[PDB]
PDB file of N, CA and C in Angstrom:
ATOM      1  N   UNK A   1     -14.943  30.513 -39.596  1.00  0.00           N
ATOM      2  CA  UNK A   1     -16.107  31.392 -39.862  1.00  0.00           C
ATOM      3  C   UNK A   1     -17.025  31.438 -38.631  1.00  0.00           C
ATOM      4  N   UNK A   2     -16.544  31.906 -37.510  1.00  0.00           N
ATOM      5  CA  UNK A   2     -17.432  31.916 -36.291  1.00  0.00           C
ATOM      6  C   UNK A   2     -16.952  33.034 -35.347  1.00  0.00           C
ATOM      7  N   UNK A   3     -17.752  34.061 -35.222  1.00  0.00           N
ATOM      8  CA  UNK A   3     -17.330  35.212 -34.314  1.00  0.00           C
ATOM      9  C   UNK A   3     -18.190  35.127 -33.071  1.00  0.00           C
ATOM     10  N   UNK A   4     -17.786  34.314 -32.120  1.00  0.00           N
ATOM     11  CA  UNK A   4     -18.577  34.193 -30.846  1.00  0.00           C
ATOM     12  C   UNK A   4     -19.879  33.492 -31.134  1.00  0.00           C
ATOM     13  N   UNK A   5     -20.119  33.067 -32.366  1.00  0.00           N
ATOM     14  CA  UNK A   5     -21.403  32.384 -32.652  1.00  0.00           C
ATOM     15  C   UNK A   5     -22.514  33.335 -32.889  1.00  0.00           C
ATOM     16  N   UNK A   6     -22.252  34.627 -32.811  1.00  0.00           N
ATOM     17  CA  UNK A   6     -23.285  35.669 -32.997  1.00  0.00           C
ATOM     18  C   UNK A   6     -22.683  37.095 -32.824  1.00  0.00           C
ATOM     19  N   UNK A   7     -23.470  38.074 -32.897  1.00  0.00           N
ATOM     20  CA  UNK A   7     -22.915  39.472 -32.695  1.00  0.00           C
ATOM     21  C   UNK A   7     -21.965  39.455 -31.544  1.00  0.00           C
ATOM     22  N   UNK A   8     -22.415  39.612 -30.320  1.00  0.00           N
ATOM     23  CA  UNK A   8     -21.517  39.612 -29.164  1.00  0.00           C
ATOM     24  C   UNK A   8     -22.025  38.696 -28.085  1.00  0.00           C
ATOM     25  N   UNK A   9     -21.235  37.873 -27.532  1.00  0.00           N
ATOM     26  CA  UNK A   9     -21.658  36.910 -26.468  1.00  0.00           C
ATOM     27  C   UNK A   9     -20.486  36.796 -25.468  1.00  0.00           C
ATOM     28  N   UNK A  10     -20.041  35.547 -25.184  1.00  0.00           N
ATOM     29  CA  UNK A  10     -18.880  35.516 -24.282  1.00  0.00           C
ATOM     30  C   UNK A  10     -17.719  34.771 -24.995  1.00  0.00           C
ATOM     31  N   UNK A  11     -16.808  34.167 -24.244  1.00  0.00           N
ATOM     32  CA  UNK A  11     -15.620  33.526 -24.861  1.00  0.00           C
ATOM     33  C   UNK A  11     -15.257  32.351 -23.990  1.00  0.00           C
ATOM     34  N   UNK A  12     -16.201  31.479 -23.640  1.00  0.00           N
ATOM     35  CA  UNK A  12     -15.884  30.309 -22.761  1.00  0.00           C
ATOM     36  C   UNK A  12     -15.419  29.126 -23.688  1.00  0.00           C
ATOM     37  N   UNK A  13     -15.004  29.395 -24.855  1.00  0.00           N
ATOM     38  CA  UNK A  13     -14.559  28.296 -25.777  1.00  0.00           C
ATOM     39  C   UNK A  13     -15.492  27.081 -25.681  1.00  0.00           C
ATOM     40  N   UNK A  14     -16.605  27.170 -26.302  1.00  0.00           N
ATOM     41  CA  UNK A  14     -17.602  26.056 -26.184  1.00  0.00           C
ATOM     42  C   UNK A  14     -16.853  24.688 -26.358  1.00  0.00           C
ATOM     43  N   UNK A  15     -17.365  23.661 -25.760  1.00  0.00           N
ATOM     44  CA  UNK A  15     -16.669  22.372 -25.858  1.00  0.00           C
ATOM     45  C   UNK A  15     -17.197  21.581 -27.111  1.00  0.00           C
ATOM     46  N   UNK A  16     -17.661  22.338 -28.057  1.00  0.00           N
ATOM     47  CA  UNK A  16     -18.160  21.667 -29.343  1.00  0.00           C
ATOM     48  C   UNK A  16     -18.077  22.652 -30.562  1.00  0.00           C
ATOM     49  N   UNK A  17     -17.035  23.431 -30.592  1.00  0.00           N
ATOM     50  CA  UNK A  17     -16.854  24.399 -31.730  1.00  0.00           C
ATOM     51  C   UNK A  17     -15.677  25.275 -31.497  1.00  0.00           C
ATOM     52  N   UNK A  18     -15.308  25.516 -30.261  1.00  0.00           N
ATOM     53  CA  UNK A  18     -14.151  26.353 -29.954  1.00  0.00           C
ATOM     54  C   UNK A  18     -14.101  27.539 -30.901  1.00  0.00           C
ATOM     55  N   UNK A  19     -15.239  28.276 -30.982  1.00  0.00           N
ATOM     56  CA  UNK A  19     -15.253  29.462 -31.855  1.00  0.00           C
ATOM     57  C   UNK A  19     -15.051  30.734 -31.037  1.00  0.00           C
ATOM     58  N   UNK A  20     -15.772  30.913 -29.995  1.00  0.00           N
ATOM     59  CA  UNK A  20     -15.626  32.109 -29.093  1.00  0.00           C
ATOM     60  C   UNK A  20     -14.179  32.245 -28.696  1.00  0.00           C
ATOM     61  N   UNK A  21     -13.830  33.076 -27.740  1.00  0.00           N
ATOM     62  CA  UNK A  21     -12.490  33.310 -27.264  1.00  0.00           C
ATOM     63  C   UNK A  21     -11.513  33.322 -28.464  1.00  0.00           C
ATOM     64  N   UNK A  22     -11.004  32.174 -28.800  1.00  0.00           N
ATOM     65  CA  UNK A  22     -10.039  32.077 -29.926  1.00  0.00           C
ATOM     66  C   UNK A  22     -10.392  33.002 -31.034  1.00  0.00           C
ATOM     67  N   UNK A  23     -11.681  33.200 -31.190  1.00  0.00           N
ATOM     68  CA  UNK A  23     -12.230  34.199 -32.167  1.00  0.00           C
ATOM     69  C   UNK A  23     -11.881  33.750 -33.578  1.00  0.00           C
ATOM     70  N   UNK A  24     -12.708  34.153 -34.528  1.00  0.00           N
ATOM     71  CA  UNK A  24     -12.463  33.820 -35.904  1.00  0.00           C
ATOM     72  C   UNK A  24     -11.041  34.124 -36.305  1.00  0.00           C
ATOM     73  N   UNK A  25     -10.711  33.899 -37.538  1.00  0.00           N
ATOM     74  CA  UNK A  25      -9.249  34.117 -37.988  1.00  0.00           C
ATOM     75  C   UNK A  25      -9.094  35.629 -38.330  1.00  0.00           C
ATOM     76  N   UNK A  26      -9.182  36.416 -37.341  1.00  0.00           N
ATOM     77  CA  UNK A  26      -9.042  37.890 -37.607  1.00  0.00           C
ATOM     78  C   UNK A  26     -10.169  38.686 -36.880  1.00  0.00           C
ATOM     79  N   UNK A  27     -10.954  37.987 -36.104  1.00  0.00           N
ATOM     80  CA  UNK A  27     -12.009  38.809 -35.433  1.00  0.00           C
ATOM     81  C   UNK A  27     -11.360  39.695 -34.399  1.00  0.00           C
ATOM     82  N   UNK A  28     -10.472  39.145 -33.599  1.00  0.00           N
ATOM     83  CA  UNK A  28      -9.748  40.029 -32.583  1.00  0.00           C
ATOM     84  C   UNK A  28     -10.619  40.201 -31.350  1.00  0.00           C
ATOM     85  N   UNK A  29     -10.250  39.657 -30.248  1.00  0.00           N
ATOM     86  CA  UNK A  29     -11.036  39.792 -28.992  1.00  0.00           C
ATOM     87  C   UNK A  29     -11.221  41.325 -28.704  1.00  0.00           C
ATOM     88  N   UNK A  30     -11.655  41.577 -27.450  1.00  0.00           N
ATOM     89  CA  UNK A  30     -11.878  42.967 -27.060  1.00  0.00           C
ATOM     90  C   UNK A  30     -11.917  43.104 -25.551  1.00  0.00           C
ATOM     91  N   UNK A  31     -11.856  44.306 -25.005  1.00  0.00           N
ATOM     92  CA  UNK A  31     -11.899  44.401 -23.521  1.00  0.00           C
ATOM     93  C   UNK A  31     -13.030  43.497 -22.928  1.00  0.00           C
ATOM     94  N   UNK A  32     -12.589  42.424 -22.463  1.00  0.00           N
ATOM     95  CA  UNK A  32     -13.630  41.441 -21.845  1.00  0.00           C
ATOM     96  C   UNK A  32     -13.330  40.059 -22.284  1.00  0.00           C
ATOM     97  N   UNK A  33     -12.291  39.845 -23.097  1.00  0.00           N
ATOM     98  CA  UNK A  33     -11.962  38.510 -23.507  1.00  0.00           C
ATOM     99  C   UNK A  33     -13.153  37.906 -24.251  1.00  0.00           C
ATOM    100  N   UNK A  34     -14.101  38.710 -24.640  1.00  0.00           N
ATOM    101  CA  UNK A  34     -15.303  38.164 -25.318  1.00  0.00           C
ATOM    102  C   UNK A  34     -15.126  38.346 -26.810  1.00  0.00           C
ATOM    103  N   UNK A  35     -15.567  37.382 -27.600  1.00  0.00           N
ATOM    104  CA  UNK A  35     -15.432  37.544 -29.066  1.00  0.00           C
ATOM    105  C   UNK A  35     -16.640  38.296 -29.615  1.00  0.00           C
ATOM    106  N   UNK A  36     -16.433  39.444 -30.217  1.00  0.00           N
ATOM    107  CA  UNK A  36     -17.529  40.202 -30.750  1.00  0.00           C
ATOM    108  C   UNK A  36     -17.026  41.312 -31.734  1.00  0.00           C
ATOM    109  N   UNK A  37     -17.914  41.984 -32.359  1.00  0.00           N
ATOM    110  CA  UNK A  37     -17.424  43.074 -33.334  1.00  0.00           C
ATOM    111  C   UNK A  37     -18.641  43.869 -33.727  1.00  0.00           C
ATOM    112  N   UNK A  38     -19.037  44.831 -32.870  1.00  0.00           N
ATOM    113  CA  UNK A  38     -20.224  45.684 -33.162  1.00  0.00           C
ATOM    114  C   UNK A  38     -19.844  47.161 -32.882  1.00  0.00           C
ATOM    115  N   UNK A  39     -18.594  47.446 -32.666  1.00  0.00           N
ATOM    116  CA  UNK A  39     -18.129  48.796 -32.359  1.00  0.00           C
ATOM    117  C   UNK A  39     -16.717  48.798 -31.830  1.00  0.00           C
ATOM    118  N   UNK A  40     -16.498  48.111 -30.753  1.00  0.00           N
ATOM    119  CA  UNK A  40     -15.082  48.137 -30.169  1.00  0.00           C
ATOM    120  C   UNK A  40     -15.089  47.317 -28.886  1.00  0.00           C
TER     121      UNK A  40
END
Protein backbone atom coordinates (compact mmCIF):
# COMPACT_ATOMS: atom_id res chain seq x y z
CA UNK A 1 0.00 0.00 0.00
CA UNK A 2 2.49 2.67 -1.12
CA UNK A 3 2.30 4.64 -4.39
CA UNK A 4 5.58 6.62 -4.46
CA UNK A 5 4.73 7.55 -0.83
CA UNK A 6 2.41 10.30 -2.15
CA UNK A 7 0.59 11.63 -5.24
CA UNK A 8 3.60 11.82 -7.58
CA UNK A 9 7.29 11.95 -6.63
CA UNK A 10 10.19 9.89 -7.98
CA UNK A 11 11.24 6.22 -8.01
CA UNK A 12 14.69 5.94 -6.40
CA UNK A 13 13.49 2.93 -4.39
CA UNK A 14 14.04 4.42 -0.91
CA UNK A 15 16.44 2.37 1.18
CA UNK A 16 13.80 1.99 3.92
CA UNK A 17 10.49 1.08 2.24
CA UNK A 18 11.17 0.19 -1.40
CA UNK A 19 7.74 1.62 -2.32
CA UNK A 20 8.50 4.00 -5.21
CA UNK A 21 9.73 2.54 -8.55
CA UNK A 22 8.54 -1.02 -7.81
CA UNK A 23 5.24 0.78 -7.30
CA UNK A 24 2.34 -0.57 -5.32
CA UNK A 25 0.87 -3.93 -6.38
CA UNK A 26 -0.91 -2.52 -9.44
CA UNK A 27 0.09 1.17 -9.42
CA UNK A 28 1.97 0.82 -12.73
CA UNK A 29 4.90 3.18 -13.39
CA UNK A 30 4.62 5.85 -16.10
CA UNK A 31 6.72 7.83 -18.60
CA UNK A 32 9.55 8.77 -16.20
CA UNK A 33 10.02 5.56 -14.19
CA UNK A 34 8.31 7.54 -11.42
CA UNK A 35 5.55 5.96 -9.34
CA UNK A 36 2.42 8.13 -9.48
CA UNK A 37 -1.26 8.16 -10.53
CA UNK A 38 -2.93 11.55 -11.07
CA UNK A 39 -3.75 11.36 -14.80
CA UNK A 40 -1.19 9.38 -16.83
